[PDB]
Structure 1
Amino acid sequence: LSTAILKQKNRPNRLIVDEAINEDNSVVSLSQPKMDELQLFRGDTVLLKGKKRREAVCIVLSDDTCSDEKIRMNRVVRNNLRVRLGDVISIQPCPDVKYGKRIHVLPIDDTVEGITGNLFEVYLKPYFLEAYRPIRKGDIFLVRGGMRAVEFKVVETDPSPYCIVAPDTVIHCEGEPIKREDEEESLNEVGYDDIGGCRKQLAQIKEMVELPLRHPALFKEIGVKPPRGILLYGPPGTGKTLIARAVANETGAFFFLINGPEIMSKLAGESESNLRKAFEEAEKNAPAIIFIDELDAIAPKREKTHGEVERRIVSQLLTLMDGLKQRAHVIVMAATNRPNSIDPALRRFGRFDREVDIGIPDATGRLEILQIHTKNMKLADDVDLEQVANETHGHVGADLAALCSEAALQAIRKKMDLIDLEDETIDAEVMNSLAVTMDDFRWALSQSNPSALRETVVEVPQVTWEDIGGLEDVKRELQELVQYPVEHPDKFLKFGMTPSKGVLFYGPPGCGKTLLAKAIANECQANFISIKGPELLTMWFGESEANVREIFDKARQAAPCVLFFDQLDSIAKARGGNIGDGGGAADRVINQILTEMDGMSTKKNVFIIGATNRPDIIDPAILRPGRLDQLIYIPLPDEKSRVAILKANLRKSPVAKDVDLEFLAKMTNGFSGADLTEICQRACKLAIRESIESEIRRERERQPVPEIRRDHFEEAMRFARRSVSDNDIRKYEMFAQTLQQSRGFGSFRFPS
């Protein structure tokens, strides 16, 4: 249905592009059976449909090596048609070819340099003498000879555009040589093939702009008018302006560009004059496309706007789009970042009827984007874009381009010892050897961060799972929670159940909640957003809920993502307990959080994790399943857990073999992990003191401490203290036992 327009349907006339081993610039060779199917004779001029609205005519030839589904074309033909190897183009004989009455040909400015003889007699005179070579306007053909072979472009071919060169034809090279940068820019043109992902959106745009122009007879027959308005809205970097550029490059109809703020002028009423001139100029050339970049710049809400001129401009846009005199085959496209900021009357059927949602690509989409981007660049053999696509979690498509650029820069960094910056030129062997490798992509991935999350970036202490001692069950639960919905969605669809997306950590201070959060941030394969407790709150009325909504929206954009609240009890507390708190600002914030986690909006892959010291004061509506689905209790470590903690802290620090951590873990009862870390730090400080004293003694005698020993740990344990009192443990156990009594059965069993 919708995807059908992107399908080629494997038409017999369309054929595979293949290399031309022997065919010259002006001829093509195909299989003789293909002539049999196409009813073509040798020497017939054939018109080849090419991308970016480029067409070239060549002399057909019979070749056995050319495959039936393939066509052999020289590099010149591919350049003129803007077609790459392996693409699919059709062949059609040129209709009613007339011999060229006159030809104007222009060289390229880079090749003409160093050519001692004049180009016409050296290149044009022998090449075109009895050539009988078909050419096209805008085609560049390479001519051998001279100190460098010269590419020649026939800017004007007469008769336009169907012609054959003959010896009697007048040949001149007068005029400025065609700029090589112009040639590259004509090569660097974006087409519909360039857009990656969002295939359905591209199909809808093709139906909007390409179908009416190609086949107006269909809509004339049915007696309907095709849509005349397209709004492309989405987060920054999805590719709206890229689609606009592709449509501009590959539509025969006229293209008119309007930048939003560019309309504004100092004189009174001059903006309306500019808009009227733009629309009238579009109407002058009948089938035309108007692209209004940044529509939200010139079309704010009329009720919201406080400026008179802006309201008059939006009214002028409304009247131009719809009025007494309706438009005559004029398509208006606008790309906006904020679709809600547009005036409501503009979003009606008359003016902007079709809204196209350019959204965040999924994994296969960003794989396709990576393939399209990396087709041009040089790559090694070990590169594997599937892994890179899997790693790039929340990236949008501009971020993928950033990743490619960073990897290329790293690759060039690697060859810096051979290269000299001061040198004017680099050795050709270096550029031949220089290429992108998988190491470059891995390093760029390490450096890469989504553009949406750039504001919420926090440096993390680089903790790994092995640094946390104990809590093995909690570690496995966290890894399963973050992994299963992402890596294995098919299982959940098979069982037809949505995953759980909430975890709350509650326990005595120093037990390992923020440590687990650091481990998840460093290790797990999902974007991490860290929110301190009260940083969302703001003086102004209604700003706090705006911040909460904005941060949840950022989490949804970068899905899969993890949202961590370090101190949940600060931001979410039992409602109605505030004598002040502004105009119930705390309660409104809590309500906003409640509606964000579990609301009528469809659930997306965002996991909310919270850590709290007092879980009792937390509002009951938060703890209801569907918000903070699972409550995990982080207890004081046991003797085995204490052994694991003491091992984990001391792995990097050199410690004497006689020191037995099991005895420390045996006596230390009720100590938190923080207390054990403090004991180890005190032992380290005592060792530092001893080493410094020995160094001072050596300096004095001028006028040791290889590892921490048993006496250091003895003194540290003398200084050690038990952080968490018994009563706090009692209140946490009271909360836990209330929950367990709510469970009501330590053991459960089905009757059999």
Structure 2
Amino acid sequence: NRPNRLIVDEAINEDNSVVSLSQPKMDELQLFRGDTVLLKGKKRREAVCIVLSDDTCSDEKIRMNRVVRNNLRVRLGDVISIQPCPDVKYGKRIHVLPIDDTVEGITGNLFEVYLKPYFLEAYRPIRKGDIFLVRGGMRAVEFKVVETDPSPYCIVAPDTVIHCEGEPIKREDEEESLNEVGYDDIGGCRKQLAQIKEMVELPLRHPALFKAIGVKPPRGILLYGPPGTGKTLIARAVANETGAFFFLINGPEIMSKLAGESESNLRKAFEEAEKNAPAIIFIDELDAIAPKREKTHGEVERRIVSQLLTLMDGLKQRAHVIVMAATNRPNSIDPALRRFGRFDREVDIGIPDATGRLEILQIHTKNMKLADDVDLEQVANETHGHVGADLAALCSEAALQAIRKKMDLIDLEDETIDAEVMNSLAVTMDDFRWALSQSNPSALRETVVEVPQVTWEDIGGLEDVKRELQELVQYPVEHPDKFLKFGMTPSKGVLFYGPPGCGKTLLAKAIANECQANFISIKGPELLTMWFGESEANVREIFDKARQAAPCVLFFDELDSIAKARGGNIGDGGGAADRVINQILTEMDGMSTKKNVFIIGATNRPDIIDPAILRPGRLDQLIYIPLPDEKSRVAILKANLRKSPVAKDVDLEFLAKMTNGFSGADLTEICQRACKLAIRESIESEIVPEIRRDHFEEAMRFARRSVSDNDIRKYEMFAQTLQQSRGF
């Protein structure tokens, strides 16, 4: 249907007037990447913009910003027409003025702060119907053009004289503000937007089709995640972005109201928003109003949760609605709300990663001006547990640390301030380092699921067991073609066992990095404290959080501490078991081989373990991690100092010889002392940097075999037969 029909999509780049396409559309287009284009759009309102080319788009799709996409009165997923035409020319007048409340409280000269610096060397097209936004000085400014050089197009040149009175504008009746949230105000969530985006999209954009079909569009959604994670943000974003009518319910709000006042208040919310459909209904803190465990005292609270049910279930299809609620943990809410015809969908919005945090940090760092020494790629690596709302108050508190010490000397106090200071005001790296050091980065910290940073090169030796792990994880994900042809079935779990400090934890994080699978780590002590006094109930959740993360490596680390809890050494009269070992391996038997979740245990004392976990179908492949030998003992040293400035004098072949029964962790203990003996001489020297050969000679003096000899023969005995361990 011709290359006059294009679709809307949301840009990767942040720049104001551009559109990004691909070469197939270019081999359809045959026009430049520096050209101007005049686009046609809905409601007789159209606008002028330029194009470039790039791979991130598909064969056919169109990247835009909101500032473009709003004037065109279009939304993501609308048919647009680029109209590839070269009308190219300069314009003349281009008289602009600021917008109603967007300048409220800021005053003064706008030429050198705003406007001018935005146009320079990047002449930007303009039309009588372009509103645009300029970022700076802690503020988002909005503009409009009542007249310019006559239409359609005007293209600035590094001359053109712009003239502006200032003063507000009349607020446009229907024209949205750009300060309303949209898919660009959310970051780190990319994967769960597209999930929410598909699922809610077409029944909002295409109310008719469903009325034409017998398909039931899912209507109800539950968003998980700990507080401050952006649940309420993601909700309103979608409602704005999709065009829907967004009504909002607070839990406390309707539990604040008088008994019997809530019922009419909760009922009206649907009844009213029934009339305005298509409609979103968002319920903040569903936990407040529907808390069924031992639930509540007295009817009036037990009554309102049954009112909610008869609205969800007793929804007859009404006309058209979709309900969205939010809560901190999936639990604590009445189970009867998750049945079908009620909130059947679930979207778990976890904490962000560093790649997510940098995405967030840039969003709250946009509008403000920064010094050149800032990094923000390092910050994301120094903020560990942080949700989005922590990481926003880390930007706004760092920026108040800047404007206290800067303008206390200016000490100017009046009704409003103008932009020159703000423009010549910046935040430095010393502030971020300061606001990161307060207790504000105190933040919620719980089970994290991520792709690990460790690579294969980060571990030395072990080259064959590296080859065997990729057999057992890489391939069944890579080649589902095979394993049908030859039949059989992949084995699910693995068990590493060996001397302490020999590399088991690392080698589990390496394959996750290799297959880009998520990695969940559950350490024996942590697992056994949540059992607390005689109760846990959270184990089934780490298998859930593993299930919705697939492909996933699920790693049970230092699995020996649990068995020695029941008892170690001499031993009890009984075997080594707890009620938290049993509910693990009921749940292993639960997960299907069609799942690509993959389990790995590790133990430093194979002597003690429960045979139940070695049974075929639980942890079958047994892998014995030996101590390193000379040629590998170089690989270890060669590795962990890869970031250390070692001097040329050293012989790593020589270290590796004098050492024999050292663990890989104890080699790092030598390399550790050497480096800390170096810094003592340097610090002395303040009354030259490099690591020196003599240093390694002194460190090597105090080195310590971490594993005894007489216990090496014990690993060598279990290396042979650990299969025998079950049955007697």
Bin for the TM-score computed over the shorter chain: 0.5 to 0.7
Cα 1:719–1:191 change in 2 (3 A) is closer
**What displacement does 1:314 show?**
0.7
Q: Summarize deviations over 1:192-230 as a string: whole Å, max 9, x none.
A: 899999999999989998877887777777799987655
For 1:96-107, list aligned pairs within 5 A: none
**What displacement does 1:589 show?**
0.7
Structure 1 range deviating more: 318-327 or 721-730? 318-327
Q: Distance in 2 between matches of 1:215 and 1:562?
A: 40
Q: Which residue in the other structure is 1:301 paired with? A: 292
For 1:38-49, list aligned pairs within 5 A: none
**What displacement does 1:568 show?**
1.4
The answer as to whether partners of 1:395 and 1:558 remain within 8 angstroms in 2 is no
SS at match of 1:84: coil
Cα 1:457–1:283 change in 2 (3 A) is closer
**What displacement does 1:534 show?**
2.1
The answer as to whether partners of 1:575 and 1:619 remain within 8 angstroms in 2 is no
The answer as to whether partners of 2:483 and 2:489 remain within 8 angstroms in 1 is yes
**What displacement does 1:687 show?**
11
Structure 1 range deviating more: 159-168 or 403-412? 159-168
Cα 1:83–1:468 change in 2 (3 A) is closer
For 1:160-559, list aligned pairs within 5 A: 177-178=168-169, 186-189=177-180, 241=232, 244-246=235-237, 248-249=239-240, 254-265=245-256, 267-282=258-273, 288-301=279-292, 304-306=295-297, 308-321=299-312, 332-336=323-327, 338-339=329-330, 341-347=332-338, 454-456=445-447, 470-477=461-468, 502-509=493-500, 511-513=502-504, 529-538=520-529, 545-555=536-546
Structure 1 range deviating more: 21-30 or 288-297? 21-30
Q: Distance in 2 between matches of 1:253 and 1:377?
A: 31
The answer as to whether partners of 1:194 and 1:372 remain within 8 angstroms in 2 is yes
The answer as to whether partners of 1:573 and 1:619 remain within 8 angstroms in 2 is no
Structure of greater relative contact order (alpha carbons < 8 Å, 6+ residues apart): 2
Q: Going by fraction, where is helix more abundant, 1 or 2?
A: 1
Structure 1 range deviating more: 621-630 or 206-215? 206-215
Q: Which residue in the other structure is 1:700 paired with? A: none
Structure 1 range deviating more: 117-126 or 104-113? 117-126
Q: Summarize deviations over 1:250-302 as a string: whole Å, max 9, x none.
A: 67775422122221126333322422343444356576543323333322337
Cα 1:499–1:692 change in 2 (3 A) is same
Q: Summarize deviations over 1:347-378 as a string: whole Å, max 9, x none.
A: 45565577788899999999999999999999
Q: Distance in 1 between matches of 2:533 and 2:671?
A: 48
The answer as to whether partners of 1:464 and 1:523 remain within 8 angstroms in 2 is yes
SS at match of 2:185: coil
The answer as to whether partners of 2:293 and 2:332 remain within 8 angstroms in 1 is no
Cα 1:662–1:431 change in 2 (3 A) is same
Paired residues in the alignment total: 728
The answer as to whether partners of 1:647 and 1:661 remain within 8 angstroms in 2 is yes
Is 2:727 the partner of 1:744? yes
Structure 1 range deviating more: 133-142 or 192-201? 133-142
Q: Summarize deviations over 1:669-718 as a string: whole Å, max 9, x none.
A: 6565677777888999999999999999xxxxxxxx99999999999999
The answer as to whether partners of 1:191 and 1:246 remain within 8 angstroms in 2 is yes
Cα 1:530–1:181 change in 2 (3 A) is farther
Structure 1 range deviating more: 393-402 or 503-512? 393-402
The answer as to whether partners of 1:17 and 1:85 remain within 8 angstroms in 2 is yes
Cα 1:710–1:130 change in 2 (3 A) is closer
Is 2:93 the partner of 1:110? no
SS at match of 2:33: coil
Cα 1:93–1:326 change in 2 (3 A) is farther
**What displacement does 1:593 show?**
2.0
Q: What are structure 1's unaligned runs of at least 5 residues?
A: 1-9, 697-704, 746-752
Q: Distance in 2 between matches of 1:60 and 1:519?
A: 42
Cα 1:51–1:417 change in 2 (3 A) is farther
Is 2:607 the partner of 1:624? no
Q: Summarize deviations over 1:509-547 as a string: whole Å, max 9, x none.
A: 454545756888999966655544323223867876434
Q: Distance in 2 between matches of 1:483 and 1:556?
A: 18
Cα 1:381–1:83 change in 2 (3 A) is farther
Cα 1:641–1:412 change in 2 (3 A) is farther
Structure 1 range deviating more: 224-233 or 271-280? 224-233
Structure 1 range deviating more: 505-514 or 24-33? 24-33
The answer as to whether partners of 2:282 and 2:323 remain within 8 angstroms in 1 is yes
Q: Distance in 2 between matches of 1:62 and 1:676?
A: 52
Cα 1:117–1:432 change in 2 (3 A) is closer
The answer as to whether partners of 1:52 and 1:191 remain within 8 angstroms in 2 is no
Q: Distance in 2 between matches of 1:40 and 1:448?
A: 55
SS at match of 1:142: strand
**What displacement does 1:590 show?**
0.7
Cα 1:547–1:250 change in 2 (3 A) is closer
Q: Distance in 2 between matches of 1:547 and 1:595?
A: 14
Structure 1 range deviating more: 374-383 or 75-84? 374-383
**What displacement does 1:561 show?**
5.4
Q: Distance in 2 between matches of 1:126 and 1:452?
A: 39
- The two structures have a TM-score, normalised by structure 1, of 0.54
**What displacement does 1:615 show?**
0.6
The answer as to whether partners of 2:137 and 2:423 remain within 8 angstroms in 1 is no
The answer as to whether partners of 1:53 and 1:252 remain within 8 angstroms in 2 is no
Q: Distance in 1 between matches of 2:50 and 2:135?
A: 20
Cα RMSD between the aligned structures?
11.7
Structure 1 range deviating more: 368-377 or 435-444? 435-444
Is 2:4 the partner of 1:13? yes
Q: Summarize deviations over 1:165-215 as a string: whole Å, max 9, x none.
A: 999999999999448899996124456899999999999989998877887
Q: Distance in 2 between matches of 1:73 and 1:617?
A: 62
Cα 1:603–1:189 change in 2 (3 A) is farther
Structure 1 range deviating more: 159-168 or 343-352? 159-168
SS at match of 1:707: coil
Cα 1:441–1:281 change in 2 (3 A) is same
SS at match of 1:468: coil
The answer as to whether partners of 2:67 and 2:178 remain within 8 angstroms in 1 is no
The answer as to whether partners of 1:302 and 1:314 remain within 8 angstroms in 2 is no
Is 2:700 the partner of 1:728? no
Q: Distance in 1 between matches of 2:58 and 2:633?
A: 73
SS at match of 1:206: helix
The answer as to whether partners of 2:137 and 2:369 remain within 8 angstroms in 1 is no
The answer as to whether partners of 1:346 and 1:352 remain within 8 angstroms in 2 is yes
SS at match of 2:102: helix
Cα 1:125–1:581 change in 2 (3 A) is closer
Q: Summarize deviations over 1:6-59 as a string: whole Å, max 9, x none.
A: xxxx58985689999999999999999999999999999999996899999999
SS at match of 1:183: coil
Cα 1:38–1:277 change in 2 (3 A) is farther
Cα 1:196–1:486 change in 2 (3 A) is farther
Structure 1 range deviating more: 561-570 or 587-596? 561-570
Structure 1 range deviating more: 288-297 or 150-159? 150-159
Structure 1 range deviating more: 461-470 or 364-373? 364-373
Cα 1:228–1:446 change in 2 (3 A) is same
Cα 1:713–1:580 change in 2 (3 A) is closer
The answer as to whether partners of 1:45 and 1:57 remain within 8 angstroms in 2 is yes
The answer as to whether partners of 1:27 and 1:58 remain within 8 angstroms in 2 is yes
The answer as to whether partners of 2:21 and 2:52 remain within 8 angstroms in 1 is yes
Cα 1:496–1:92 change in 2 (3 A) is same
Cα 1:73–1:396 change in 2 (3 A) is closer
Q: Summarize deviations over 1:145-183 as a string: whole Å, max 9, x none.
A: 999999998999999999999999999999994488999
Structure 1 range deviating more: 494-503 or 49-58? 49-58
Cα 1:339–1:193 change in 2 (3 A) is same
SS at match of 1:180: coil
The answer as to whether partners of 2:555 and 2:599 remain within 8 angstroms in 1 is yes
SS at match of 2:607: coil
